[PDB]
């Protein structure tokens with residue numbers, strides 16, 4: 001059994017991990033390879049602050065709500081583990097700010113200590129009028145990816161830096177099963193009109209007095225397009241940029257100002273913050289995550305493709321549930337090959 | 341009128357500030373001076389985490405409840421000013437842990453979003469079965485004292501480094517009013533069997549992923565003697581040492597171990613954190629705060645003395661309340677002495 005995972009983001013490496021640990025003992029000959037065009041420093045998973053928060057309203061598939069819950073409980077059960085720091089995992093509370101009362105989210109009982117904001121809190125934010133507060137978790141892309149790599153390496157999983165042209169290419173060279181975790185770039189190996197880049201730009205800033213996250217929502221600008229501040233481990237993420245269909249992997253001087261202006265207004269203290277760096281990333285935007293099997297007619301036999309992509313702006317939030325599920329599907333293949 | 345403030349602690353400096361700006365227009369020859377033995381770098385006020393939190397059970401002086409109140413309100417109202425980073429002001433939420441279900445505090449509705457810990461939160465703290473969660477404030481003394489200083493220097497308030505031997509030494513030399521803000525040392529100038537040092541030892545550690553304060557209460561150890569973890573701006577405070585009567589201004593290898601074990605068990609992520617610094621200090625412990633007048637019979641006439649000391653573990657928490665009250669008592673003086 002030769003498995004090939006394409007993708008070295010969270011989805012790729014996390015899915016790689018679950019399939020190993022769940023099956024390395026039941027399949028004496030289980031060889032798992034990671035093929036990636038980009039690695040630990042240069043993936044979308046690195047631009048992300050890694051704040052756990054799925055969508056407010058239940059999207060396309062309600063099975064997604066579970067995968068978040070799953071990812072949350074998992075991370076949560078390890079917030080105090082001694083390796084938490086390598087994982088880049090930690091707790092953070094903070095604010096969700098609105099202009100009008102809006103229904104509680106589906107995840108209200110997943111996070112810790114959910115509640116509405118009280119008058120005095122809303123006073124610190126003039127432009128906003130209603131909102132939530134709760135404790136969540138942050139999983140920073142950087143450390144997590146690095147930790148996944150270490151686990152995977154001692155696990156025998158070899159890593160190769162290469163660009164795949166086709167599933168056929170890989171199938172053609174020995175793979176029984178291909179786990180497809182190619183993020184926003186999935187289109188290149190198989191057309192999918194429903195996968196678009198939701199371009200984002202963030203600013204990293206030195207402001208350690210900021211201990212809470214602050215997310216703003218606004219229908220005039222839309223999902224992920226109003227100012228947000230997310231204190232990270234070493235730095236604070238200043239963002240609020242979402243542009244469907246923009247493939248420009250390049251920081252924009254106009255986007256910069258937009259980030260800076262809106263976060264400064266939200267939180268005046270940020271005025272004297274030291275700017276540490278800027279990054280641009282593409283959210284694998286899609287109506288629903290493609291987490292399903294496909295059988296590609298390779299020629300003699302066909303090969304087994306598991307897709308896992310289109311995690312939107314919430315891939316760190318849900319990755320784990322997705323990986324458990326992807327492994328379930330891997331399990332189903334095994335039986336169907338009378339070699340479980 | 342000649343004013344002399346003894347003490348360059350928070351109490352000292354804030355009281356001089358309050359008095360000045362409230363009276364420099366109406367008292368033409370208002371010459372204020374600070375006399376101190378120790379300044380900004382090395383006072384008790386520097387050792388303080390600066391976490392706003394009165395005691396749980398109420399104080400003798402039901403006033404102290406309003407003073408902390410006005411302090412929180414005052415600070416909370418400046419948290420988003422341009423100069424907040426300079427004051428070392430910012431918001432921080434966190435836990436209070438207990439063994440048994442205990443009554444609510446009196447300041448319950450002063451802080452933002454007070455509430456109880458949910459079972460899932462208590463699950464993160466094995467050794468504790470109940471507690472609260474709320475959003476308080478931190479005013480780090482190091483920065484606060486520096487800000488105060490710069491205010492005062494630009495208002496003409498001259499500072500002198502000298503150790504006062506007696507109230508009369510200062511009276512003898514021309515001082516009309518003497519503002520007595522000498523902290524745990526107040527007795528050296530005038531006998532007070534109530535004023536005592538609650539020695540405290542802390543540890544400054546590098547752990548920027550902790551964005552929550554954690555305060556424990558173990559009755560089999562007493563107030564301030566349970567482990568606590570207070571994230572500051574640059575560094576995290578680790579503590580849990582309270583010793584009534586101990587005047588040893590020196591770190592204790594045995595007190596260190598106690599800090600470090602108590603805190604690692606409270607939060608294991610702390611085990612792989614870098615120890616940046618360590619300090620000792622004396623909480624000016626007194627059954628209640630002394631804040632009142634006293635006529636000094638120095639000869640042909642009296643000199644006025646305003647005492648404002650004995651703030652135990654909550655000087656920062658309360659300082660603004662006490663300083664308003666002292667400028668007030670400074671007023672009474674003015675009217676009686678026909679000079680309003």
Ligand SMILES: Cc1cc2nc3c(=O)[nH]c(=O)nc-3n(C[C@H](O)[C@H](O)[C@H](O)COP(=O)(O)OP(=O)(O)OC[C@H]3O[C@@H](n4cnc5c(N)ncnc54)[C@H](O)[C@@H]3O)c2cc1C
Pocket residue numbers: 006007008009010011012035036037038039043044045046047048049050051052053162163164165181182183184185186188189199200201202239280281282283284309310311312313314315316317318
């Ligand atoms: C600005 C910004 C902020 C964000 N903040 C958050 C947040 O707070 N919380 C959150 O949960 N999510 C957040 N996200 C989104 C989250 O980062 C993504 O949904 C998540 O990283 C998706 O994982 P992935 O599929 O990108 O792995 P990817 O990043 O897609 O992995 C891509 C790897 O696949 C490789 N690859 C692709 N195609 C091929 C090919 N044909 N051949 C070889 N290799 C290939 C690439 O080279 C790359 O190495 C944010 C995103 C952005 C842009």
Ligand SMILES: Cc1cc2nc3c(=O)[nH]c(=O)nc-3n(C[C@H](O)[C@H](O)[C@H](O)COP(=O)(O)OP(=O)(O)OC[C@H]3O[C@@H](n4cnc5c(N)ncnc54)[C@H](O)[C@@H]3O)c2cc1C
Pocket residue numbers: 346347348349350351352375376377378379383384385386387388389390391392393502503504505521522523524525526528529538539540541542579620621622623624649650651652653654655656657658
């Ligand atoms: C470990 C520890 C942690 C603490 N944490 C907190 C906290 O989290 N939150 C909080 O609110 N509080 C905390 N505190 C305590 C709080 O910081 C103090 O109660 C507060 O600083 C009291 O103000 P003050 O009396 O110290 O002014 P001080 O700092 O004590 O005043 C000192 C000045 O008086 C001068 N002086 C005294 N006598 C004379 C003299 N005869 N002649 C000349 N000068 C004289 C000294 O030289 C010095 O300049 C903590 C204390 C400790 C020890």
Ligand SMILES: N=C(Cc1ccc(O)c(O)c1)C(=O)O
Pocket residue numbers: 051053200215216217223224225228239283313314
């Ligand atoms: N996930 C985020 C952070 C974020 C940003 C804005 C929001 O309204 C929100 O709910 C979350 C992002 O993709 O950037």
Ligand SMILES: N=C(Cc1ccc(O)c(O)c1)C(=O)O
Pocket residue numbers: 389391393394395540555556557563564568579623653654
């Ligand atoms: N003021 C603190 C911090 C602290 C420590 C323990 C407590 O129970 C509390 O209310 C506050 C201290 O003096 O140390």
